[PDB]
């Protein structure tokens, strides 16, 4: 149930918490993780040239703000068995300021 | 079609063609390739810690002395599009010696 | 560091110095080096139905009018190990004229 | 292929992956590296007071905006042999900002 958020502190979130392992350019690499360019509108584990586990491709879940929300709580409670590393952020508007970020920064 | 081979010749053939990318010992480090401890038995792609590309893992190829002949001769015409920067070892008795040694090195 | 110069001097460069080994319309023959058409903006080892050298893949440097006039000075310096038995342009008038001609020939 | 870029960001850059083994000021001091006041235009190796490798030496490249970015992708790659410990700036609009700073910080 997202509501849009600061887009400045939101990238401020994405740099210190994913850019270790995604990158979110049009064509960029993909580090541990893969890149996050057009992730929204586009079914989990749709990205070229990345091995999704059978978790994130079995999921099938079309991206969007709402349900990557509740993805970003608990990345492994929503898709369980994920090979991504993160605990998750916890706080609503933290979600909320990166998710407006990453929805200009990966159009 | 593999025949066994001098495996003290073969430690030389890992240590001056393979060794630079690869490492062999249980639970060792990824250099520019992956750790290759219990390569045979297992799927192509599926060494934990590792960024694959999308050819490897596609590949599905359960590891063997056999199937291992066959893409040390020619890496890239066997896995096409591997990151994997190789010719081959094109004399057989190079990659029989060098299999020889990488099974006991790697089980 | 790469300036143009005269495609007509390039043109006499490279059919005196390159020709014998090299073919540059597009799909042509891999004589004694591989066919150079699309070789700019072409990662150094990536032309299809040529046999390279570990050393020529393992470069993997993207061609380009800069790192071309470097590698055209000293093969063997450039890429250490390279079957191209060439010497090298060592003016760098003659490499300007060539990569002119070069150019426009490739793509 | 270089093309300029930050300077203020290029700044920031030297100063958190370079810094520390090197300075830029006329006249400054060797750290772990060696100094780089006049590195443009001056061959590979030339800094009074460093005792570089045989390497660094042997490579004898003029430093340019050109190569100086290529160095910079793989020091390791481009110089095989080199005691400069450092991965490389693999993105492109890094190593642009990093030596729009660095061209007029040395000259
Ligand atoms: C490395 C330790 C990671 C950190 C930190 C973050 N992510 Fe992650 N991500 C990582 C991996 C290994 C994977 C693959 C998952 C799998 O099991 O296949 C992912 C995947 C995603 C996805 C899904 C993409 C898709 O299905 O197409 C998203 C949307 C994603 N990652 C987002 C994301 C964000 C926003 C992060 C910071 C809060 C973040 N990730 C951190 C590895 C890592
Ligand atoms: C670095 C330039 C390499 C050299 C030399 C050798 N290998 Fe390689 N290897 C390298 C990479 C980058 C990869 C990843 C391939 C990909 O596209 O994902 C690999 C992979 C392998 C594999 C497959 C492992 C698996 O699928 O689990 C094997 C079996 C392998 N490498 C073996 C091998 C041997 C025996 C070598 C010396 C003759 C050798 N490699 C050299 C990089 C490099
Ligand atoms: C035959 C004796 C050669 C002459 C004379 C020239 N080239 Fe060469 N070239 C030759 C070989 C055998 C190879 C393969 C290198 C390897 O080790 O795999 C090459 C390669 C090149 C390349 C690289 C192409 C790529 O990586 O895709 C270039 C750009 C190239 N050759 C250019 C070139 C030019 C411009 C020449 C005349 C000045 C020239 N070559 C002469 C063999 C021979
Ligand atoms: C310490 C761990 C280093 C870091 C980080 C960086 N550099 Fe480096 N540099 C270092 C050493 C030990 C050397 C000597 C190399 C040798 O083998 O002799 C160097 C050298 C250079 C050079 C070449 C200078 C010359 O040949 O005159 C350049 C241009 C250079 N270093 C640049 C550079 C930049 C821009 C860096 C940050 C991105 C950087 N270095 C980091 C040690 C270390």
Not at 17 to 30: S, W
Not at 67 to 76: D, H, V
């Amino acid at each position: 149930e997202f509501k849009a958020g600061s887009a400045k502190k939101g990238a401020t979130l994405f740099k210190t918490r994913c850019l270790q392992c995604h990158t979110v350019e049009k064509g960029g690499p993909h580090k541990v993780g893969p890149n996050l360019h057009g992730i929204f509108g586009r079914h989990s584990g749709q990205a070229e040239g990345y091995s999704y586990t059978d978790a994130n491709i079995k999921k099938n879940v079309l991206w969007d703000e709402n349900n990557m929300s509740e993805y970003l709580t608990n990345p492994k409670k929503y898709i369980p068995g994920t090979k991504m590393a993160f605990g998750g952020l916890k706080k609503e508007k933290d979600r909320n300021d990166l998710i407006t970020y990453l929805k200009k920064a990966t159009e």
